[PDB]
């Protein structure tokens, strides 16, 4: 039987999730949408040829007893209230990152969810579903390189829009590494420090420091060094290397495109779009959520607790951005509800 979905926020990512549910993946149908821009909502219904109701607000959508699951794809600051409203229903909830824009918001969600009989929230941290990243985690977990001592990673993006702020270097960009590392390492963070190398001449945005170096430490003592470089020009690239006691593991060359020998060079194209880079991870992530809902079983992907860990760490990082000082992180032990 088909999972009936409502979508709250029908903007760029909302429409892309609608397209996934409608055109790409199996077992779901979007039967309801809402957007504070009523005309965005009508356009979603029209462009994707949906047989769906346009609701005036999230409150009304969430009262429709035929919707099995809701996708919350509104502005980040709008997630917390919408997730809290959806937690008064029995519906499963897929929320894009962040779970909330403040860690207090994220704690409100984790507390209302823990009153429920079962977990219903998955948060859209897609990196965990990326085939290469997953495969590296699985190899690490065999023990073949011993314990992880240091992780080195890069999050490289060619250019940013005029609205991109210094804070978004954490909340839009580093946030992916923030969710990924504790999961990769099965460990908890103890601190984060953001430092600023010399400022690139490519930055055109007031207040934006680029590149940024993030250093995170974990309870077992692993150090994570992430380079965030968002005006890098050359391409979009995610790099990850785990230094172990007895060996190292790293992500391979990404790309399907041909090797060209021409004009005294050998070359391959580099991805320019994060959207294309993570197409597979988004498909896999959403298909898994739908397959869980179809079985009436809780999601198994990143939970509200992961959303809360990410919110606390992002807050610690935004605080570090002010003076480049290390900010301690102490995350409470995970409730068994979320193991």
Ligand X SMILES: NC(=O)c1ccc[n+]([C@@H]2O[C@H](COP(=O)([O-])OP(=O)(O)OC[C@H]3O[C@@H](n4cnc5c(N)ncnc54)[C@H](O)[C@@H]3O)[C@@H](O)[C@H]2O)c1
Q: Convert residues 211-250 into a mask of x (bound to ligand CBU by CB under 6 A) and - (unbound).
A: -------------------x--------------------
Which residue's entry shows tokens 């149908």? 29
Q: Which is nearer to ligand X, 58 or 113 (CB)?
A: 58
Q: Among residues 122, 98, 139, which one has the least CA distance to residue 240?
A: 139
Interacting residue with ligand X among 48, 183, 274, 337 (CB under 6 A): 274
Here the tokens at position 66 are 């035929």
Q: Among residues 220, 239, 290, which one has the least CA distance to residue 3?
A: 290
Here the tokens at position 167 are 């804070």
Instruction: Report if residue 294 touches a second copy, rule: CB under 8 A.
Output: no
Interacting residue with ligand CBU among 34, 95, 101, 157 (CB under 6 A): 157
Strands 28-34 and 3-8: parallel
Rounded to the nearest 10°, the torsion over CA 227, 183, 24, 40 is: -70
d(CA 301, CA 303): 6
Q: What's the closest the beta carbon of residue 272 comes to a second copy, in angstroms?
A: 6
Q: What's the closest the beta carbon of residue 82 comes to ligand X, in angstroms?
A: 6
Round the CA-based radius of gyration of the chain to a whole number and report it: 20
CA triple 275-278-282, angle to 5 deg: 100
Q: Which is nearer to ligand CBU, 254 or 337 (CB)?
A: 254
Interacting residue with ligand CBU among 82, 95, 101, 173 (CB under 6 A): 173
Instruction: Report if residue 171 touches ligand CBU, rule: CB under 6 A.
Output: no
Q: Considering only residues 71 through 100, tell me which ones interact with ligand X, judged by CB under 6 A.
A: 73-76, 78, 96-97
Q: Considering only residues 273 through 292, tell me which ones interact with ligand CBU, judged by CB under 6 A.
A: 274
Instruction: Report if residue 254 touches ligand CBU, rule: CB under 6 A.
Output: no
Helix (H) or strand (E) holding 40: helix 38-47
Q: What's the closest the beta carbon of residue 174 comes to ligand CBU, in angstroms?
A: 9
Is the CB of residue 277 less than 8 Å from the CB of residue 187? no
Q: Which stretch binds ligand CBU (CB under 6 A): 37-45, 171-179, 191-199, 314-322?
A: 171-179
- List the strands of the sheet with 69-72, edge to edge: 53-54, 28-34, 3-8, 69-72, 92-95, 121-123
d(CA 309, CA 154): 21
Q: What's the closest the beta carbon of residue 21 comes to ligand X, in angstroms?
A: 15
DSSP 49: T
d(CA 235, CA 28): 34
Q: Which stretch binds a second copy (CB under 8 A): 65-73, 75-83, 251-259, 312-320?
A: 251-259
Instruction: Report if residue 198 touches a second copy, rule: CB under 8 A.
Output: yes
Q: Which stretch binds a second copy (CB under 8 A): 31-39, 167-175, 245-253, 312-320?
A: 245-253
Distances (CA, A) of 290 to 24, 63, 139, 248: 13, 20, 27, 36
Q: Which is nearer to ligand X, 92 or 278 (CB)?
A: 278
d(CA 65, CA 74): 22
Q: Which residue's CB comes closest to ligand X?
A: 11
Interacting residue with ligand X among 19, 22, 40, 294 (CB under 6 A): 40
DSSP 21: I
Give me the residues that bind a second copy (CB under 8 A), please: 23-27, 131-132, 135-136, 139, 144-150, 152, 195, 197-202, 211, 213, 217, 220-223, 225, 227, 229, 231-235, 237, 243, 245-253, 255-270, 272, 287
Give me the residues that bind ligand CBU (CB under 6 A), please: 157, 172-173, 176, 230, 274
Give me the residues that bind ligand X (CB under 6 A), please: 8-14, 34-37, 40, 58, 73-76, 78, 96-97, 124, 126, 172, 274, 278
């Amino acid at each position: 039987m088909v999972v009936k979905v409502g979508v709250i926020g029908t903007g760029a990512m909302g429409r892309a999730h609608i397209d996934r549910l409608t055109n790409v993946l199996t077992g779901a149908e979007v039967v309801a949408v809402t957007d504070i821009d009523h005309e965005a909502a009508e356009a979603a219904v029209r462009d994707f040829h949906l047989n769906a109701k346009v609701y005036p607000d999230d409150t009304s959508l969430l009262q429709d007893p035929d919707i099995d699951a809701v996708f919350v794809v509104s502005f980040g600051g709008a997630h917390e209230a919408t997730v809290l409203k959806a937690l008064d229903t029995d519906k499963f909830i897929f929320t894009e990152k962040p779970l909330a824009t403040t860690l207090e918001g994220a704690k409100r969600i984790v507390d209302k969810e823990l009153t429920k009989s079962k977990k219903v929230i998955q948060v859209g941290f897609m990196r965990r579903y990326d085939q290469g990243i997953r495969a590296l985690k699985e190899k690490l977990d065999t023990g073949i390189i011993g314990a992880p001592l240091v992780v080195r990673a890069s999050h490289i993006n060619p250019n940013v829009a005029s609205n991109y702020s210094n804070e978004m270097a954490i909340t839009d960009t580093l946030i992916h590494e923030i969710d990924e590392m504790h999961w990769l390492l099965d460990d908890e963070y103890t601190s984060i420090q953001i430092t600023y190398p010399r400022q690139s001449a490519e930055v055109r945005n007031e207040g934006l420091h680029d590149p940024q170096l993030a250093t995170l430490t974990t309870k077992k003592g692993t150090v994570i060094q992430v380079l965030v470089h968002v005006t890098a020009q050359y391409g979009y690239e995610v790099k990850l290397e785990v230094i172990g006691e007895t060996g190292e593991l790293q992500l391979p060359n990404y790309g399907l495109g041909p090797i060209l020998r021409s004009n005294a060079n050998q070359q391959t194209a580099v991805e320019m779009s994060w959207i294309n880079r993570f197409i597979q991870a988004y498909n896999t992530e959403v298909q898994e959520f739908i397959d869980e809902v179809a079985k009436s079983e809780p999601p198994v992907g990143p939970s509200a607790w992961d959303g809360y860990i990410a919110a606390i760490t992002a807050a610690a990082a935004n605080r570090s951005q002010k003076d480049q000082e290390t900010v301690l992180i102490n995350v409470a032990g995970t409730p068994t509800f979320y193991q």
